[PDB]
């Protein structure tokens, strides 16, 4: 939602990140929701994101907030011609 | 107060001739305002020029359709036909000058497979 109605995050991922609020922090969150935007609540956690064939890990840092998860999980493999 | 009807392209003009001075009025507007450009004015006068009847009638016209040039031709045809309407004697001069024939030229249909009415797409031989 790129309007002023509000941000967008899938509830089946928001539930996981806010239930991972404990100090344990040893629950790497696996997800397929590439389209979910990154909230400030995500800070600290570590999320594996599906990029088509595997779950690649991303570490949600401070300046990564606001973007979409799928940005950090490339889906094409390019090396050179 | 004698009628006449002129058509050209997609434009229709209803002309009517009254005896009088010669002031020219188009669609409740003056002939110098509605058609401003100087040389787009001699087209209407030619039917009144091929015979020396320049200041013998005032025209009242109601025109619609087409662009500024096309309705000039329509109103030309209309005023000529009205001139024949007033006097059944002026036919030889105008028919001689070819000022009665309606223009049978109309914009042409488009055609499928062609970029216009006759333009064909580019083709290569190298």
């Amino acid at each position: 939602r790129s309007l002023k109605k509000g941000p967008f995050v899938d509830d089946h991922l928001m539930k996981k990140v806010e239930a991972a609020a404990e100090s344990e922090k040893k629950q790497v969150i696996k997800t397929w929701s590439r389209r979910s935007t990154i909230f400030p609540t995500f800070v600290g956690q570590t999320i594996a994101v599906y990029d088509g064939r595997k779950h690649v890990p991303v570490y949600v840092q401070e300046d990564m907030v606001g973007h979409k998860l799928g940005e950090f999980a490339p889906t094409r493999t390019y090396r050179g011609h | 107060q004698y009628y006449g009807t002129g058509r050209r392209k997609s434009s229709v003009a209803r002309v009517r001739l009254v005896p009088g001075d010669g002031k020219i009025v188009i669609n409740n507007r003056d002939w110098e305002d509605y058609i401003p450009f100087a040389a787009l004015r001699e087209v209407i006068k030619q039917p009144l020029v091929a015979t020396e009847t320049l200041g013998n009638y005032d025209v009242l016209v109601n025109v619609h359709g087409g662009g500024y040039t096309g309705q000039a031709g329509a109103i030309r045809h209309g005023v000529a036909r009205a001139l024949l309407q007033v006097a059944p004697e002026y036919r030889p001069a105008l028919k001689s000058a070819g000022l009665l024939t309606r223009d049978p030229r109309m914009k042409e249909r488009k055609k499928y497979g062609l970029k216009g009415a006759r333009r064909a797409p580019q083709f290569s031989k190298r």
């Binding site: 973007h67 940005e71 490339p74 | -």
Partner: protein, 114 residues
């Protein structure tokens, strides 16, 4: 003269747009707000007029630090490790357009044939 040199024979509305951060519309705003007419040659400007112009211009972003601000934006989005950052590294169209043909004002002139 006003942060950087400007042409002399051109009108000030056309001369102020030689600064990295001023264009056709914000120059009009500066000239209208200050009071000078947009049809006065800059060589005909009084000292008080240019004096008034200078701080109005310096309040809003200036040609100097805008370079570093936009460059640090690019550096932030390229150090994060995003798709746009990878494009900025490799030098390819950042906005989502095709690259089989017509990516030339980025990739440069048509390189040597393979």
């Amino acid at each position: 003269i006003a942060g950087v040199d400007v042409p002399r024979e051109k009108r000030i509305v056309i001369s102020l747009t030689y600064i990295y951060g001023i264009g056709k519309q914000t120059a009009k705003e500066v000239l209208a707000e200050a009071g000078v007419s947009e049809d006065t040659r800059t060589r005909d400007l009084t000292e008080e007029e240019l004096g008034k112009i200078r701080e109005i211009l310096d309040r809003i972003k200036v040609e100097g630090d805008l370079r570093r601000e936009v460059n640090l934006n690019i550096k932030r989005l390229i150090e994060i490790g995003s798709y746009r950052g990878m494009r900025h590294r490799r030098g390819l169209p950042v906005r989502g357009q095709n690259t089989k043909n017509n990516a030339r004002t980025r990739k440069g002139p048509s390189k040597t044939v393979a």
